[PDB]
Design an enzyme around this catalytic site. Structure first.
Site, PDB file in Angstrom:
ATOM      1  N   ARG A  80      50.434  65.185  27.478  1.00 44.63           N
ATOM      2  CA  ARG A  80      49.289  64.809  26.664  1.00 44.63           C
ATOM      3  C   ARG A  80      49.673  64.337  25.278  1.00 44.63           C
ATOM      4  O   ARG A  80      48.817  64.324  24.388  1.00 44.63           O
ATOM      5  CB  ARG A  80      48.308  65.978  26.565  1.00 44.63           C
ATOM      6  CG  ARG A  80      47.793  66.439  27.913  1.00 44.63           C
ATOM      7  CD  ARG A  80      46.842  67.613  27.791  1.00 44.63           C
ATOM      8  NE  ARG A  80      46.926  68.493  28.953  1.00 44.63           N
ATOM      9  CZ  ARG A  80      46.233  69.617  29.096  1.00 44.63           C
ATOM     10  NH1 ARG A  80      45.396  70.008  28.149  1.00 44.63           N
ATOM     11  NH2 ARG A  80      46.379  70.350  30.188  1.00 44.63           N
TER      12      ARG A  80
HETATM   13  N1  LIG Z   1      38.310  60.834  31.490  1.00 40.35           N
HETATM   14  C1  LIG Z   1      39.615  60.971  31.814  1.00 40.35           C
HETATM   15  N2  LIG Z   1      40.361  59.923  32.202  1.00 40.35           N
HETATM   16  C2  LIG Z   1      41.658  60.052  32.526  1.00 40.35           C
HETATM   17  N3  LIG Z   1      42.309  61.223  32.488  1.00 40.35           N
HETATM   18  C3  LIG Z   1      41.683  62.358  32.116  1.00 40.35           C
HETATM   19  C4  LIG Z   1      40.271  62.286  31.751  1.00 40.35           C
HETATM   20  N4  LIG Z   1      39.896  63.523  31.424  1.00 40.35           N
HETATM   21  C5  LIG Z   1      40.971  64.328  31.567  1.00 40.35           C
HETATM   22  N5  LIG Z   1      42.035  63.631  31.981  1.00 40.35           N
HETATM   23  C6  LIG Z   1      43.371  64.206  32.229  1.00 40.35           C
HETATM   24  O1  LIG Z   1      43.251  65.610  32.437  1.00 40.35           O
HETATM   25  C7  LIG Z   1      43.867  66.340  31.378  1.00 40.35           C
HETATM   26  C8  LIG Z   1      42.970  67.490  30.951  1.00 40.35           C
HETATM   27  O2  LIG Z   1      43.068  67.679  29.548  1.00 40.35           O
HETATM   28  P1  LIG Z   1      41.818  68.190  28.692  1.00 40.35           P
HETATM   29  O3  LIG Z   1      40.567  67.790  29.412  1.00 40.35           O
HETATM   30  O4  LIG Z   1      42.039  67.662  27.305  1.00 40.35           O
HETATM   31  O5  LIG Z   1      41.933  69.793  28.604  1.00 40.35           O
HETATM   32  P2  LIG Z   1      41.004  70.845  29.390  1.00 40.35           P
HETATM   33  O6  LIG Z   1      41.928  71.571  30.325  1.00 40.35           O
HETATM   34  O7  LIG Z   1      40.466  71.697  28.279  1.00 40.35           O
HETATM   35  O8  LIG Z   1      39.970  70.017  30.090  1.00 40.35           O
HETATM   36  C9  LIG Z   1      44.107  65.337  30.271  1.00 40.35           C
HETATM   37  O9  LIG Z   1      45.313  65.592  29.559  1.00 40.35           O
HETATM   38  C10 LIG Z   1      44.196  64.018  30.983  1.00 40.35           C
HETATM   39  O10 LIG Z   1      45.550  63.728  31.328  1.00 40.35           O
END
Ligand SMILES: Nc1ncnc2c1ncn2[C@@H]1O[C@H](COP(=O)(O)OP(=O)(O)O)[C@@H](O)[C@H]1O
Ligand SMILES: Nc1ncnc2c1ncn2[C@@H]1O[C@H](COP(=O)(O)OP(=O)(O)OP(=O)(O)O)[C@@H](O)[C@H]1O
Ligand SMILES: Nc1ncnc2c1ncn2[C@@H]1O[C@H](COP(=O)(O)OP(=O)(O)O)[C@@H](O)[C@H]1O
Ligand SMILES: [Mg+2]
Ligand SMILES: [Mg+2]
Lengths: 188, 42, 495, 48, 467, 161
Positions: free
Chosen positions: C365
């Site tokens: 990330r």
């Molecule tokens: N809308 C999206 N499009 C593409 N990849 C996503 C999207 N949402 C999440 N991801 C992937 O899933 C991972 C989840 O991270 P995040 O959502 O920031 O933390 P959490 O576990 O709190 O949901 C992200 O690092 C990303 O790589």
């Protein structure tokens, strides 16, 4: 609730709670010395073989215990505080551990008048000249008002040197630990 | 004190050090075992 | 001999006035001490048998002290001396190349640790102002990790996978690869690796230290071993000791890398420590605290901005998942604390595809940020091509479909690697370039490995000037691209 | 060389300790007590 | 008053007073520290003893220290001077720009609005997200929940909402990051500085920030949420203005409460959780309400531990939300993003009298067809699709097209995907799904719908794929 | 059973005593008395044990199945003690058979329950990891010799996790 006056030293457990209650009761009315007297007298009374054996049987009604204790506290004309304390212990059923209670109070009284206890350990007895100079130096550790309460002791385990305990402070002049320290240093 | 005591204990040992002092057969046996282990790995 | 007698003198035999307490009851690894009136919480008391303990509970009438050794060396009635300092550990560049246990006591032989500074294992992570975004790249020397799921400096990646899928191998290759940076001129690319071994066989760590010494990699590595036999309160503490030895660098302007291996065996030591304190077990018998335990530890892998020295502390926690269940309790506790993750499949591994990174699920990330521009150019295409190949590999028609299948298989064969064989960034760039632009689509997949090897031996021998050009100018210019294309075409011709 | 010398030193310490334990069997206890009391004076003076 | 510490177990400090005790919920200052350690009272053990929860590290606390009563609960600086600042639980600034110079302070333990103050008006909030707009239309002025496991999208989604909603907003905003990464908080700070939402040289800031990130002891994590609620309650009442209040992650509130509830000597409830889980959550979520004086729109990201929606924490919080949005790992593993689960997301404004009839009918048709496909999946996974009727094959094709079309590329996920972020207006969403359901696109392939905005882009991508 | 476990154990004992000169220990943790007697007599027949001419290659230690848990959790350490002697004070390689290794963890679990410790995840003692570590971590190859342990393993409920 009332503002019970905190005893100087804090004890814990059921013994400590009863002792603190008694100390705060006596401190108000300023009856500490006499109360200690009646306590160290019930100390002798309760050791009486008849009473000692009667108060440990759980098959004599508790009311019988309280009645007997009222009888044995009226005869000695104990202060109302001590009679109430013993009745309280009989009611609650803790008189089985009275010696812990009164003992605690004794401690809680020593710390009141400054008898900061000490303890000296050695591999042999001590010449009264040496012991007296020892007391004179140890007196320098305390503060004003406090008075040393020395307690000699003997252990064979420690070769030489000496061990001193002053309330919480602790100095290990013994030769056992010196030898161990040297051995660790010359191994590590 | 005990620093001087250790000093003099070493002095009086080294002075009786015409070799390994009061070692015993275990001395030689263990040393030979270790030496032969070294030989096996060398 | 007289050396030993000098060893005698100079020892501190001075006696001091010290507060003391008396043990009441030792059992289950938690001693109860009586006294110690002026003992701080989380202080380090010392028993009479040379042991140490952390004053854990300050109850009104006693002190619950967790022993940092075997509680069979503690009686009832022993004497506990307070050392008047929250649990400390020795830090400094004097530890580099030393195998110290969880408390900084060298278990190495090789004399004692000559450290002059001490940190607190129970410090606090940097706040929100000191930190700055991750900018610099942490070169793992592993093609799959460096191209697809890159890592930065200040990031805290996770390595998660089953038994024997090559997590320790990735850690060790990352440690070894830093050798080239730790010899160059600038102190800005030097990385001082650390390696915490938690609940691991002692023979494993011994052989790991031997391997790191073969590769000349102990000049900068610190190994903090709290192995399987060591009492639970030591496996619980080892990560914090290591993290402090790394925070020292981070706070003195340098760059550190700390590898906890595993953190699934610290949480087990903590669960032991808790259930023996009677604390109320939760989900899987873990205490509810088993999150704060890892969150507070991994929140220290920060990247301080330039007004705070500019140092950094990368972290590579290694979790181990039974039957590859990524949704278990601890794996998810840690997946929500870290900035990325590298899944090591156990069926890719059993296919000989090693290292077994499961690029479908792995992610970083901070990713494209803190990646060399050259690798970015070469590897964005690889990411897209691998994505397309994955979309279709569920059956084995047209020209484009078969093209995707063939290119993906070639790239998979290209990303395999051998142990203790890290590759400079430019070498990875060259290989992945020859792979993605399409100078391998005719060669049989089975041969793609041999090609790779041979190609390297060529490029490293002959064209080191081009590789130096790529390294210095961290980018593939047009002329560099043309020269590299010529090299690849010519080499492939003679095959 | 390492092996023989390190085992030599280990035995060195073993017997040296065993025999100083015996040598503590003199009648110097008065000197030890005097030194201890003097050091107690030092500590008391320093601690106030 | 002045008491003295008598026990220190983890984050729970037992203190003793000789004069009058402080009433429960007060704050106490540990006199003799190198920083400010505030202990908040929680119990009255008796013997003029109280049991307190420390809002900072309790390392170095000597049995017998002196604790000094404040007389009032934790009070934080509220007002228009907190806009653009950052604050810890006890309200100190942690952005290094000097004190928060306000006129009026607020206690963090106020009471919930009374029943005679609740507002009832309901109105759709358009977010630009296809699935959220279609199946679980958010309500303007109502609590909203994002239920997610670890690594599914809760934060990318809450950041997309931040962007879309807030930047196009007139009122203030509060972000109470409780028990979440510290680098994420730093990135959010430095990403609102560059958007002009926070201003470091003026008074035109719109966002207040409060942080109890995951490095903080359990005492702090369990109370930073209340600090956020207070900073938002002020803007709701003493300004009569519309507030947005984002919280991430609100499950850390209850988790921290349970971490520091074994030490308080309580019998542990179902899964080790505190016996007071439901009431502790209620007394917090009941101050996050739109009332007749203002209007708070709360977006809360709920973590679902070990991917268990029957866990007591999410199971309890499901009853405090207008619209839920259950992000699921099963969908995210298919690459669809946002991973929203269409058949677990719900709303209270999915009413034909609120969102009209075309919107409601399209949403319900989408859900019906997705549910039918889900029912088929059990057979499909074994007997393949070659064992289905023709209507079933057609249903499966439409369902896969719809599953893909629900996926959208976000602006904040450009760095991940590279694709350009899209806002799909509500009418475009309804139109596209109406067309997919009618059958106007049975000739295109599934992948033509994957990660596209309005259906025009789907048609364009299907054209690209055909060459 | 029925696959050649005992014959394989005897062959390993024989070969290691013949091609290396190193003896062997057999710690029958939680050993059925019937199976223990059968193993003893199979060994006597097969020559690894010999009752006459002081040339036996095996040291048998048996913690039977009818002994309190406190005794089935310690027999593995008795076997390890004998083998550690053969490794350190006679500097050779050793085999150490442990049948069974599951009954070792179970005995530890019962002892911990008896003492009154909160059971861990699936009823196993909280100290399972370090109880296994203290034993398994003395089976190593030091600089004097090595102990090679062959540990019969039972998987409860066909559950490898
Ligand atoms: N809308 C999206 N499009 C593409 N990849 C996503 C999207 N949402 C999440 N991801 C992937 O899933 C991972 C989840 O991270 P995040 O959502 O920031 O933390 P959490 O576990 O709190 O949901 C992200 O690092 C990303 O790589
Ligand atoms: N890149 C690789 N190529 C070939 N073999 C590998 C590679 N990485 C690891 N292995 C092999 O896998 C085996 C175990 O690997 P490794 O110990 O690194 O996995 P692990 O997860 O650390 O195991 P554990 O965690 O149980 O210690 C070793 O035999 C090692 O040689
Ligand atoms: N190498 C071998 N040659 C001949 N027979 C064998 C061999 N290995 C195993 N067997 C047979 O398999 C049977 C298995 O019994 P055994 O292994 O002695 O006990 P257990 O079944 O408890 O392991 C033996 O009776 C033996 O006859
Ligand atoms: Mg490993
Ligand atoms: Mg998040």
């Amino acid at each position: 609730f009332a503002k019970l006056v905190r005893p100087p030293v804090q004890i814990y457990g059921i013994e400590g709670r009863y002792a603190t209650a008694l100390y705060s009761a006596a401190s108000k009315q300023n009856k500490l010395e006499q109360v200690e007297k009646e306590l160290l007298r019930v100390g002798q009374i309760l050791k009486e073989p008849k009473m000692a054996a009667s108060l440990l049987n759980p098959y004599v009604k508790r009311s019988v215990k309280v009645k007997s204790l009222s009888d044995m506290t009226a005869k000695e004309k104990f202060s109302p505080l001590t009679s109430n304390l013993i009745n309280l212990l009989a009611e609650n059923g803790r008189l089985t551990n009275t010696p812990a209670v009164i003992s605690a109070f004794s401690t809680m009284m020593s710390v009141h008048r400054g008898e900061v206890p000490c303890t000296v350990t050695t591999a042999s007895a001590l010449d009264e000249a040496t012991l007296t100079e020892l007391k004179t130096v140890l007196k320098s550790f305390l503060s004003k008002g406090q008075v040393l309460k020395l307690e000699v002791k003997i252990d064979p385990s420690i070769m030489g040197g000496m061990i001193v305990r002053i309330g919480e402070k602790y100095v290990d002049m013994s030769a056992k630990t010196k030898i161990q320290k040297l051995s660790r240093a010359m191994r590590e | 004190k005990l620093f001087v005591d250790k000093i003099r204990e070493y002095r009086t040992k080294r002075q009786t050090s015409g070799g390994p002092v009061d070692a015993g057969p275990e001395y030689q046996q263990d040393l030979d075992r270790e030496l032969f282990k070294l030989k096996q790995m060398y | 001999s007289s050396i030993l007698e000098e060893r005698i003198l100079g020892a501190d035999t001075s006696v001091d006035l010290e507060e003391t307490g008396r043990v009441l009851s030792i059992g289950d690894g938690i001693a109860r001490v009586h006294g110690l009136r002026n003992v701080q919480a989380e202080e380090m008391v010392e028993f009479s048998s040379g042991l140490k303990g952390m004053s854990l509970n300050l109850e009104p009438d006693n002190v619950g002290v967790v022993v940092f050794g075997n509680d069979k060396l503690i009686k009832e009635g022993d004497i506990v001396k307070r050392t008047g300092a929250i649990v400390d550990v020795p830090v400094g560049e004097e530890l580099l190349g030393r195998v110290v246990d969880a408390l900084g006591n060298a278990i190495d032989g090789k004399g004692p640790i000559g450290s002059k500074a001490r940190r607190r294992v129970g410090l606090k992570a940097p706040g929100i102002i000191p930190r700055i975004s991750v900018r610099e790249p942490m070169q793992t020397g592993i093609k799959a990790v460096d191209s697809l799921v890159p890592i930065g400096r200040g990031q805290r990646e996770l390595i998660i996978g089953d038994r024997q899928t090559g997590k320790t191998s990735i850690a060790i290759d990352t440690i070894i690869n830093q050798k080239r940076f730790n010899d160059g001129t600038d102190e800005k690319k030097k990385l001082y690796c650390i390696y915490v071994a938690i609940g691991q066989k002692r023979s494993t760590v011994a052989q790991l230290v031997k391997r790191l010494t073969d590769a000349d990699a102990m000049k900068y590595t610190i190994v903090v071993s709290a192995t399987a036999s060591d009492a639970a309160p030591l496996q619980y503490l080892a990560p914090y000791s290591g993290c402090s030895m790394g925070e020292y660098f981070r706070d003195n302007g340098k760059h550190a890398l700390i590898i906890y291996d595993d953190l699934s065996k610290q949480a087990v030591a903590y669960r032991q420590m808790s259930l023996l304190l009677r604390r109320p077990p939760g989900r899987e018998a873990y205490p509810g605290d088993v999150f704060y335990l890892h969150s507070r530890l991994l929140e220290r892998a920060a990247k301080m901005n330039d007004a705070f020295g500019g140092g950094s502390l990368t972290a590579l926690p290694v979790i181990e998942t039974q039957a590859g269940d990524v949704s278990a309790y601890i794996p998810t506790n840690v997946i929500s604390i870290t900035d990325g993750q590298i899944f090591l499949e156990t069926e890719l591994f059993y296919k000989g595809i090693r290292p077994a990174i499961n690029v479908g699920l792995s992610v970083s990330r901070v990713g494209s940020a803190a990646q060399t521009r050259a690798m970015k150019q070469v590897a964005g295409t690889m990411k897209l091509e691998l994505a397309q190949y994955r979309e279709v590999a569920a059956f084995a028609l047209d020209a484009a479909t078969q093209q995707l299948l063939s290119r993906g298989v070639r790239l998979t064969e290209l990303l395999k690697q051998g142990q203790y064989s890290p590759m400079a960034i430019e070498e990875q760039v060259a290989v992945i370039y020859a792979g993605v632009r399409g100078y391998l689509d005719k060669l049989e997949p089975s041969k793609i490995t041999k090609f790779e090897n041979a190609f390297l031996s060529h490029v490293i021998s002959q064209h080191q000037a081009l590789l130096g050009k790529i390294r210095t100018d961290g980018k593939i210019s047009e002329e560099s691209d043309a020269k590299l294309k010529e090299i690849v075409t010519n080499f492939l011709a003679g095959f | 060389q390492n092996m023989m010398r390190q085992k030599e030193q280990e035995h060195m310490i073993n017997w040296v300790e065993k025999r100083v334990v015996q040598s503590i069997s003199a009648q110097q206890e008065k000197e030890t007590i005097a030194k201890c009391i003097a050091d107690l004076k030092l500590l008391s003076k320093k601690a106030q | 008053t002045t008491g003295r510490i008598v026990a220190v177990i983890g984050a729970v400090v037992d203190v003793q007073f000789d004069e009058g005790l402080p009433p429960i919920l007060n704050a106490l200052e540990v006199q003799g520290r190198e920083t400010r350690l505030v202990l908040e009272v929680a119990q009255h053990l008796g013997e003029s003893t109280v049991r307190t929860i420390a809002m900072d590290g309790t390392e170095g606390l000597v049995r017998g220290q002196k604790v000094l009563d404040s007389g009032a609960p934790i009070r934080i600086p509220v007002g228009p001077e907190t806009l653009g600042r950052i604050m810890n639980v006890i309200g100190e600034p942690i952005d290094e720009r000097g004190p928060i110079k306000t006129k009026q302070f607020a206690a963090i333990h106020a009471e919930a609005p009374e029943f005679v103050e609740m507002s009832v008006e309901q109105e759709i909030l358009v977010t630009g997200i296809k699935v959220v707009d279609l199946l679980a239309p958010y309500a303007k002025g109502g609590k909203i929940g994002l239920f997610g496991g670890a690594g599914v999208g809760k934060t990318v989604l809450i950041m997309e909402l931040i962007n879309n909603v807030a930047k196009a907003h007139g009122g203030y905003s509060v972000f109470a990051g409780v028990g979440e990464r510290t680098r994420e908080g730093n990135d959010l700070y430095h990403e609102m500085i560059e958007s002009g939402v926070i201003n470091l040289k003026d008074a035109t800031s719109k966002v207040a920030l409060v942080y109890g990130q995951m490095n903080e002891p359990p005492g702090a994590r369990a109370r930073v949420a209340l600090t956020g609620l207070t900073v938002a309650e002020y803007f709701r009442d003493q300004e009569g203005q519309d507030v947005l209040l984002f919280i991430d992650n609100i499950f850390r509130f209850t988790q921290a409460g349970s971490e520091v509830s074994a030490l308080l000597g309580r019998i542990p409830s179902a899964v080790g959780y505190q016996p007071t889980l439901a009431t502790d959550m209620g007394t917090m979520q009941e101050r996050i309400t739109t009332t007749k004086k203002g209007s708070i729109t709360s977006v809360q990201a709920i973590y679902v531990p070990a991917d268990d929606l029957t866990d007591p924490a999410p199971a309890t919080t499901f009853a405090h939300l207008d619209a839920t949005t259950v992000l699921s790992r099963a969908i995210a593993e298919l690459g669809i993003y946002p991973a929203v689960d269409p058949l677990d997301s719900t709303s209270r404004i999915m009413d034909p009298n609120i969102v009209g009839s075309e919107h409601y009918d399209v949403a319900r048709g989408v859900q019906k067809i997705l549910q039918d496909y889900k029912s088929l999946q059990d057979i499909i996974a074994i007997l393949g699709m070659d064992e289905l009727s023709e209507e079933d094959k057609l249903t499966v094709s439409r369902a896969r097209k719809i599953q893909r079309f629900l996926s959208q590329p976000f602006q904040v996920a450009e760095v991940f995907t590279g694709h350009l972020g899209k806002l799909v207006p509500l009418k475009e969403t309804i139109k596209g799904f109406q067309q997919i359901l009618a059958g106007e696109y049975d000739h295109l392939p599934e992948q033509a719908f994957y990660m596209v905005g309005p259906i025009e882009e789907a048609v364009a991508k299907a054209d690209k794929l055909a060459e």
